[PDB]
Amino acid sequence: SDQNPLPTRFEVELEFIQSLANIQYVTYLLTQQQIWKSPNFKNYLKYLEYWCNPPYSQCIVYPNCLFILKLLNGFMESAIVNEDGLLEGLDELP
């Protein structure tokens, strides 16, 4: 009934960049241990800034996600990573 094909890479990345519009979720991420061991995740989020420009940006329905993405990126460069995965500057929060 309700069913359609699996998503594209375009479709998947659009769905993903846009869920960063929700702060609880973005928080759940920075408090992961695994993803900050390797530069993979950090490097991926910088790649995703391709949405910040046209024609891509015209597809965004949730505009907060692009701002949060940009912040999250700058944070990362200067961000000091613990030895486990803990992002140093956040340890203190609840």
């Binding site: 990345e13 993903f16 597809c59 329905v61």
Partner: protein, 54 residues
């Protein structure tokens, strides 16, 4: 979890990217470096936002 494509984003592939981009100037995925290059815009403008949700 995050999209499967994250796995390809290693510092090695990143270094090889600039050269790969040139050679190419000479869905269609054929190697890992293709994932470090944004997908192409679909033809159907239904992918264009109808509005904004804040």
């Amino acid at each position: 979890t995050s999209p499967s494509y994250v796995k390809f984003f290693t510092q090695s592939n990143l270094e090889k990217l600039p050269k790969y981009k040139e050679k190419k100037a000479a869905e269609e995925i054929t190697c890992a470096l293709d994932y470090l290059i944004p997908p192409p815009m679909p033809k159907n403008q239904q992918y264009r936002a109808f509005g904004s949700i804040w």
